[PDB]
């Protein structure tokens, strides 16, 4: 395979059962790491996960967790290290969102996304450091941001507040954490092919809306990801810390100004 | 009397009773302002600042509130209503900051610096803006931010997470209210002469290090923060939205490549 | 009067004689300043101009150069300094572009664009430096950079490159002669109502494809950009040196994002 | 090896006889690619650098050029077709610096390193892409830029601007030619242990001075930097564009507030 470092390493993804952390949970397998499938519910798409990370080439187990509850990702990096005897590399990767007028937007409503995509990924972040700094071990943490790190996003002010706030987090992370060989980046994905888009993108305006806004001309495929974070991972990305990778075709370059508009 | 246009405006502060928001309380007075001056503690300090924004020429409330408090923000809004009879202009400033190695920080104190310094503004920011939305009003809001925002900050990851989330909050919101004439801006500070500094500059050792890393070799005086703000909120900035103004003698430049080291 | 300390200042102005310059010259004439205009081709619209600022309040005078032409930068420096005795301020503020689909760009029409846009910066930056060394002035420059330091622009990537240029130098000469109270700025103007642009916005479907990528909804005023110019040079902007000021109705926060898209 | 897809690729590298050059030469050698060595006199080094791709499993051919002749450029990519038959990958690596005072620095030095590091570079990318979109084929430009088109430079004032503009050129180009599959992407290394630098790293003081500005505590390595462009040259960046990925040890996270100094 392509990253032979990669070869036994623990890796934990959460939200790891769908989507981008189902990619990166099979694409770890398939460079023969031990792979820790965190899940909200949905137990069978989780159990299908763990089988493909198998029949890649990887080994693999599940843990359920909500990474809103401290215990539970307390409990999901320990399970970790209890299975497989240690940990390499933590992915935090859960997230939500959804659209509202801000000026209408609940507090309840914002403390959900922010409490998932920004503190749940503080939260992993730090068991997995902790563990790091108490072992020794020059491990390694990818955050799962978005274009809209940087990009600003009308009716999902959390969303954008969140990851806003993962950037900082993780070059502070970074910036603290390099004198221990221990590195910390963001990966920026795009517009991507993943479940909670099925419905938007069967839809052929609004895939077209979409496309428009992607200067490459088509919308990511997960492996894309994916592949960002084998990367990022591996010993290849020895020098680099602190850094968001965008994989967005272009996304952050601003579509409105393709041919030399305004 | 510079900004003439800010004379009568009715402008809500958040921890305007010390510090840069007592001197942003004092400035807009100055400009003859209707200043608004919350506060969550200190009633006397409150009342000492009450009465500068009076000498300097303008009128002045203080109204008690916790900014963690949806309530109290929501309480905030409507008293400035009543007593002066609409809202200009909302200065999100209340901030609060600890040192902690980030892999012993606490689920309840990065909360605490989340709750205050980045949902606290979530929430002024919503209240201001439904108000300017349902009211037809080219409504202001000023979120204060920091260095932080782009510069990392080891022992602060909750502070800086908070302001990188600051960031895009203002961004997307300047983005989704610009149509309707409504300007959303942070003000970046660097090192400030403060209360929160007090403890770090009265050592001759600790002021000298903070002052090596500013590149115009000083301390920042309140003042010169507030004149920021002053220019943000007036009609001279009517083009200006979405941005962070940094007012930081240089610090964002990267302290240590001054004289060309590397 | 607004910044009363500008009165009597003297403020160069490169390409004062049209659009952008032409208001700051105008503005800096209100404050009652003492404004030297640079023009290259047209004394006519130079003259016309010295007449605004003198009707202003100001006083004026007009001096032919070539900003890709050291000579001819040295030269208005030392004018500005015989005529009104010394200098304040340097607006670097000359600028040229044409569309060119970038694999078809020949390399003279690149080296124009560079020579003018940010060479003639660094000259005119290079030769206020150097007298406020010399003579231990606490002056300032602005150099006038555009949206296009960040937002990306096909068929102007000579302009792009210049501008992206401009905020390096500018930020590198801010912290290199900030220990000596010597202030270095940037202003990013968005879609401007200039000579530049009318071609552009006679055309009643193009003027409404540049609004409708403004997120205010209208095509900047040159007085607003003079305003924030005017913030800048003065004292109320002690603190604030190396930073980017857009102007720009918010269009560097993502046009194609406005409602939500993507 | 490692990226199977780079097997047999064509691979254009300037400055690729010392340095980060050479490496890259070298680990596109190491992934069977077919390597054409750009250089500016030193012929020798050239020969030495050709041999280490051949005995590292690649092609290779060294061609002498100067970046600031245009004639030059355009021979150096004919060559590169004519020789192996096409064009896959660009990578504009040549680069020239020195210290100067910022007020001292002649128009003739400025204009040298501009013409080199900014001016050659989009010579390059412009001719790569010329042949590209000619052919239909879905090339890749590697632009070699550095931890300074971020991080301001005193005493390298014409470095700066010359990456700051490299910066805004990459990130057109991306946008422009995004729609045609051809990417085009910014490396960012920090301090890394190349000729250039190793007069200045056998002296132990400046050898600690300059560690002390890495977050990870070591120059980098040039294969380190070698690892990022194949990756980025790859497939497996497939829906990377527009990007600089700063391979720097943590530099531009700003090294002066380690340990929550500020
Ligand atoms: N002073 C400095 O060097 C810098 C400060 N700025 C920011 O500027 C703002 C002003 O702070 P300073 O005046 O410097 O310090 P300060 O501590 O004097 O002011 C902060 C204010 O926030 C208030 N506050 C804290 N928690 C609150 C709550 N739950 N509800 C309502 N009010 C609350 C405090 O009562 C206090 O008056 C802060 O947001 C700070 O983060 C940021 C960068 C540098
Ligand atoms: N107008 C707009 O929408 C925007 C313009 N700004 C920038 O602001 C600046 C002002 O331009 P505008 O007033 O809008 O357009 P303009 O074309 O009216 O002004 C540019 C001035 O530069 C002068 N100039 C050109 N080459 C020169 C040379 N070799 N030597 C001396 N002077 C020379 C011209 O004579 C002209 O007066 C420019 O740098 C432009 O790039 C940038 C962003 C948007």
Redesign the interface.
């Given at each position: 395979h392509?990253?032979t470092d990669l070869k036994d390493k623990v890796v934990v993804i959460t939200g790891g059962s769908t989507g981008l952390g189902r990619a990166m949970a099979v694409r770890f397998g398939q460079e023969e790491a031990k792979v820790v499938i965190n899940y909200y519910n949905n137990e069978e798409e989780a159990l299908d996960a763990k089988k493909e990370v198998e029949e890649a080439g990887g080994q693999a187990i599940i843990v359920q967790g909500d990474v809103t509850k401290?215990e539970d990702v307390v409990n999901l990096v320990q399970t970790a290290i209890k299975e497989f005897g240690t940990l390499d590399v933590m992915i935090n990767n859960a997230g939500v969102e959804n659209?509202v007028?801000?000026?209408?937007?609940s507090?309840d409503n914002?403390?959900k996304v922010?409490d998932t995509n920004?503190?749940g990924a503080?939260?992993g972040?730090?068991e997995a450091?902790?563990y790091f700094?108490e072992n020794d071990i020059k491990g390694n943490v990818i955050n799962m941001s978005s274009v809209?790190?940087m990009?600003?996003?009308?009716?999902?002010?959390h969303y954008?507040?969140?990851?806003?706030?993962?950037?900082?987090?993780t070059?502070?992370?970074?910036?603290?954490?390099?004198?221990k060989?221990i590195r910390v980046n963001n990966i920026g994905p795009?517009?991507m092919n993943t479940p909670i888009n099925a419905e938007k993108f069967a839809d052929p305006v609004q895939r077209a809306?979409?496309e428009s806004?992607i200067?490459?001309?088509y919308i990511?495929?997960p492996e894309?990801?994916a592949?960002?974070a084998?990367?990022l991972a591996s010993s290849?990305?020895?020098?680099?810390?602190?850094?968001t990778?965008?994989?967005?075709?272009?996304?952050?370059?601003?579509?409105?100004?393709?041919?030399?508009?305004?």
């Open positions: 392509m990253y401290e659209p007028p801000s000026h209408e937007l507090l914002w403390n922010i920004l503190t503080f939260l972040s730090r450091i902790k700094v809209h790190e990009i600003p996003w009308p009716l999902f002010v954008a507040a969140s990851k806003g706030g993962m950037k900082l987090m070059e502070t992370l970074a910036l603290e954490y390099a004198p060989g795009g517009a809306d979409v806004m200067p490459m001309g990511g495929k894309e990801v592949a960002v084998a990367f290849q990305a020895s020098y680099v810390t602190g850094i990778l965008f994989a967005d075709g272009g996304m952050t370059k601003y579509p409105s100004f393709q041919a030399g508009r305004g």
